[PDB]
Design a protein around this ligand. Structure first.
Ligand SMILES: Nc1ncnc2c1ncn2[C@@H]1O[C@H](COP(=O)(O)O)[C@@H](O)[C@H]1O
Ligand SMILES: Nc1ncnc2c1ncn2[C@@H]1O[C@H](COP(=O)(O)O)[C@@H](O)[C@H]1O
Lengths: 245, 254
């Protein structure tokens, strides 16, 4: 158990008053991994930090680019050209200097997923944009019962109020999620239950895609909300599991 | 009005691809005011900046406090003690160096509201928590046809997916929004029209508020409330997306 300090309580007293004290300690003791520190994952990382999560691992190899400005929290003039995960880590340490932050400067693949998951996370937030590594991460967590929430495509969507969580089998208006389902079936043997579920929780939006007016565009208001919904869902699941003993 | 530089196109190419070039220009030419740079308003400011809005005014007099950390984007160890609005303005300059940012180092009151709205904003996002100034800001915007979105209480709520926008007359499970309607009726004579509406768009949540108990548990019931970034920021984001939707619709009409 992480020892909650007096400074921690000043930072996160609003967390305790919202989730309860038991949950404050649960979060302080958690270790959550965010894979992909982009339009969705950067805001998920931010949210975790600001809700008193005591250890966070960030996995990404990309650099901050000027084109990230429309949708990524780390995308500032002075950060362009630096490694996203490390820039996000430094920010998290400014949020909570007592958070233990680990950076994995790499992409997830079939060959390294086991090693990177071997840490033993309380949750994994999958915010990867590419379908191949995405499928590899999901298939691994799902087989190994590692708690996971995945995110669909957040581009080409303008309305944050249509974001919701459902089984990956049941998402609509999400070409990324659809390709992911195909890849999981074809490459990993993952297929629906008797109930028609893949047993993978997925943040998506019912909104129909808005085609490009350099692929689909994106907006902070939606991409960040994907990440915030993923975090709220993960924390809810962790609190329910803990109450179920 | 604003000539979009190549740097600006690089920053906001994703914005253009989502909303169109005409919208990119509309946003570059816009001037939006954020009142209250806190749990809701700091994220609304961030979103405006990140959506290529060309001018932003920020109104607040408070300083960054360590207790802001759970829900405000400017709450970082090195910023504690500095004025919230100025820290945010400085961040907005890092997002878009060509954004025109104005800091009003003050609180809105019944007596100064006309001066602070007199500028001619494309939109006002009201993220003030205190009720009497909030009522005064809304009454003034509403009377003067100044495009406004207001935000109910984002504290005591955990679910970002229940946030939506409706007329202030129709909000539920929002005690702030209900005390507001009263102050507006009582001090400004703002009351429902015959269709049941106040003519004020409000971000609110259908979620029942969660109240902290003396024993450290919390109890949902249909320094006060706790809060979470995931919910407070999404209030701000839903406000911004609503405003931009309305602005684009207005521009489509001509
Ligand atoms: N296989 C992977 N493992 C970890 N992070 C990834 C992987 N593939 C893509 N990413 C990151 O996912 C992020 C996507 O963000 P965005 O560009 O907004 O969709 C980027 O920062 C990528 O570098
Ligand atoms: N009358 C006012 N005019 C402008 N900003 C205000 C006023 N009253 C409160 N605020 C700010 O509104 C913000 C509310 O943030 P929060 O504490 O997260 O609700 C704080 O930064 C306050 O300083």
């Amino acid at each position: 158990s992480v020892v909650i300090s007096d400074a921690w309580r000043q930072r996160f007293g609003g967390t305790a008053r919202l989730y309860g004290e038991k949950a404050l300690q649960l979060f302080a003791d958690a270790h959550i991994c965010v894979v992909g520190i982009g339009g969705v994952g950067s805001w998920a990382a931010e949210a975790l930090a600001r809700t008193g999560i005591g250890a966070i691992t960030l996995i990404d190899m990309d650099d901050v680019c000027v084109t990230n400005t429309n949708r990524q929290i780390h995308a500032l003039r002075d950060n362009v050209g630096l490694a996203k995960a490390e820039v996000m880590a430094e920010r998290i340490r400014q949020i909570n200097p007592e958070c233990r932050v680990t950076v994995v400067d790499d992409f997830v693949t079939p060959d390294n997923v086991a090693q990177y998951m071997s840490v033993g996370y309380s949750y994994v937030i999958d915010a990867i944009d590419s379908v191949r590594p995405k499928a590899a991460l999901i298939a691994y967590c799902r087989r190994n019962k590692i708690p996971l929430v995945t995110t669909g495509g957040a581009g080409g969507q303008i309305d944050p109020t249509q974001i919701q969580v459902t089984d990956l089998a049941k998402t609509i208006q999400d070409p990324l999620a659809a390709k992911l389902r195909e890849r999981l079936k074809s490459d990993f043997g993952v297929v629906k239950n008797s109930k028609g579920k893949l047993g993978v929780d997925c943040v998506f939006s019912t909104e129909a895609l808005v085609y490009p007016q350099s692929g689909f565009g994106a907006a902070t208001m939606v991409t960040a909300t994907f990440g915030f919904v993923a975090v709220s869902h993960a924390l809810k699941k962790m609190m329910a599991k803990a109450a179920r003993q």
